[PDB]
Design a binder for this molecule. Structure first.
Ligand code: NAG
Ligand code: NAG
Lengths: 200, 50, 163
C-alpha cells in the first residue's frame, strides 16, 4: 500500500471590500431601451450576493451555461457585464449561442463559448396600452450578418429596388426599421418580455 | 502530457470540481481519464521493448 | 517624418512607435467614416490626464497653448461612452503602442525604456506590456495620428516629429 499525511485545518483569504453594488438598479429599473440599442452596464468593486435573487422567484427562465447557479457564492470574477432590453414573447428561444433567426443575425447573438446566465420574466401590464404600444423599435432588413456583441446604429435607406435607392426613397426601397405592437387585447407570445444577460 | 485538454473544458480537476455539479463533471473526468490511460500504456510498452 | 497627416489603412493591428524626443504628437482618432455622421473614437493625452470619448465630434488641427483642446472637437451629441483617468506618458525615450480589437474589446500595449538617441531606429530588444483595455464595441477600418503644433514662443513650432 501507500501512505500519505492528512491535512489538519483549512484557511480562507479574500479581499476586504464591502459595498452592496447596484444589482437593484439593473433589475429594479424604470424603463429599458430597445432591442437594437441594448444598453451595456459595468458592475465592479462589489460584494455581490447571488442567491438573494432566488428568494424572489418571479422569473420564468433562469439558465446558466458554464457554471452551476449554486456555486456562485464562493467564486471571484472580473469584468461582470450586464445587458438589458425588451423583446417579443416568442424570440426568447432565439437568445442562445448558435441559433438561426431574424434577430439572431440582425440584432443580437452570443458567441459559441458563452459563460454566464440569462434571465427572462413577463411584463404585460406595465408595458402594454389598450391603444397599442408602438414605441419599441427593431430592424428587419439588412444584407449582412453582424458579429457577436456588435451594435448597429443606422437610419439609412436600404438599397432594395433594382434601381439606386437614392432618389427612390419611398416604395420599392423599404426603410429597414420597424416597430412592434403590444396590446392587452392579444394572447400569449405577443407580449413584451424583460431580458438580462450576465457575462463573466 | 498533464497539460492537455483531450476535449474537456480545462486541464485542472479542481476547477471543474469548483465550477460544476457532478452530472456535468462526469464527462470531462472520463475524457481526461482515457487520455492519461493511453499515455501510460504507451510508455510501459516502450520500456519493455528497450 | 512630417515637416511643418492623412488616413492609414487599419484591419490588421497597427504598431505605432516613436523613440526620439517627443512632446508634439499627442492623440489618435479612428472610425469607419471619419466624420460626425457615424460612430468615432477620440483619445487625447497631452500633459495632465487621458480623455476618451466615443461620439460624433466635429473634426474642425494645430494645438497651441490641460490646454487648448477644442480644435479637434466642437460638441459631442448623442453618444454613450466617456472616460477619464491618469495620464501614461512623460515629459532617447522609446514609446511603443499596439492597437488591437477582438470581439469589440480594444487592447493597448505600452512599453517605455530610456535610451541614448543615435539612430532613427535602434536594434534593441523589447517586450511590450498591457496597460489599458476598454470596451469600445464599434467597427473601425481606418485611423489617423494627430500632431499637436505647439507654440514655443518663437507663427508656430517647427514640427519635425517622426513616426
Ligand atoms: C425590485 O423591486 C421590488 C419591488 O417591491 C423590490 O421588492 C425588490 O427588492 C427589488 N430588487 C430585486 C428584486 O432585486
Ligand atoms: C466596418 O466599416 C467598413 C467601412 O467601409 C465596412 O466596409 C465594414 O464592412 C464594416 N464592418 C462591420 C463589421 O461593420
Amino acid at each position: 500500500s501507500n501512505f500519505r499525511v492528512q491535512p489538519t485545518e483549512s484557511i480562507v483569504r479574500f479581499p476586504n471590500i464591502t459595498n452592496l453594488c447596484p444589482f437593484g438598479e439593473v433589475f429594479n429599473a424604470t424603463r429599458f431601451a430597445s432591442v437594437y440599442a441594448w444598453n451595456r452596464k459595468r458592475i465592479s468593486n462589489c460584494v455581490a450576493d447571488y442567491s438573494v435573487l432566488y428568494n424572489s422567484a418571479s422569473f420564468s427562465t433562469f439558465k446558466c451555461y458554464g457554471v452551476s447557479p449554486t456555486k456562485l457564492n464562493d467564486l471571484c470574477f472580473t469584468n461582470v457585464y450586464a445587458d438589458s432590453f425588451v423583446i417579443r414573447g416568442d424570440e426568447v428561444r432565439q437568445i442562445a449561442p448558435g441559433q438561426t433567426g431574424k434577430i439572431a443575425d440582425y440584432n443580437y447573438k452570443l458567441p459559441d463559448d458563452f459563460t454566464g446566465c440569462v434571465i427572462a420574466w413577463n411584463s404585460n401590464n406595465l408595458d402594454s396600452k389598450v391603444g397599442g404600444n408602438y414605441n419599441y423599435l427593431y430592424r428587419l432588413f439588412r444584407k449582412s450578418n453582424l458579429k457577436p456583441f456588435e451594435r448597429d446604429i443606422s437610419t439609412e435607406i436600404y438599397q432594395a429596388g433594382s434601381t439606386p435607392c437614392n432618389g427612390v426613397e419611398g416604395f420599392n426601397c423599404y426603410f429597414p426599421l420597424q416597430s412592434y405592437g403590444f396590446q392587452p387585447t392579444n394572447g400569449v407570445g405577443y407580449q413584451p418580455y424583460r431580458v438580462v444577460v450576465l457575462s463573466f | 502530457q498533464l497539460s492537455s485538454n483531450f476535449g474537456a473544458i480545462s486541464s485542472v480537476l479542481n476547477d471543474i470540481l469548483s465550477r460544476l455539479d457532478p452530472p456535468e463533471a462526469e464527462v470531462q473526468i472520463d475524457r481526461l481519464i482515457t487520455g492519461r490511460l493511453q499515455s501510460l500504456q504507451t510508455y510501459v510498452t516502450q520500456q519493455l521493448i528497450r | 517624418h512630417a515637416i511643418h497627416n492623412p488616413v492609414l489603412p487599419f484591419n490588421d493591428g497597427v504598431y505605432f512607435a516613436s523613440t526620439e524626443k517627443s512632446n508634439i504628437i499627442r492623440g489618435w482618432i479612428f472610425g469607419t467614416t471619419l466624420d460626425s455622421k457615424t460612430q468615432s473614437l477620440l483619445i487625447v493625452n497631452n500633459a495632465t490626464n487621458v480623455v476618451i470619448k466615443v461620439c460624433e465630434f466635429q473634426f474642425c488641427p494645430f494645438l497651441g497653448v490641460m490646454e487648448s483642446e477644442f480644435r479637434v472637437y466642437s460638441s459631442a451629441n448623442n453618444c454613450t461612452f466617456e472616460y477619464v483617468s491618469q495620464p501614461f506618458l512623460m515629459d532617447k525615450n522609446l514609446r511603443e503602442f499596439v492597437f488591437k480589437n477582438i470581439d469589440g474589446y480594444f487592447k493597448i500595449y505600452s512599453k517605455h525604456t530610456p535610451i541614448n538617441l543615435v539612430r532613427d531606429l535602434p536594434q534593441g530588444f523589447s517586450a511590450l506590456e498591457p496597460l489599458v483595455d476598454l470596451p469600445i464595441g464599434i467597427n473601425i477600418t481606418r485611423f489617423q495620428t494627430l500632431l499637436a503644433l505647439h507654440r514655443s514662443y518663437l507663427g508656430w513650432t517647427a514640427g519635425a516629429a517622426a513616426y
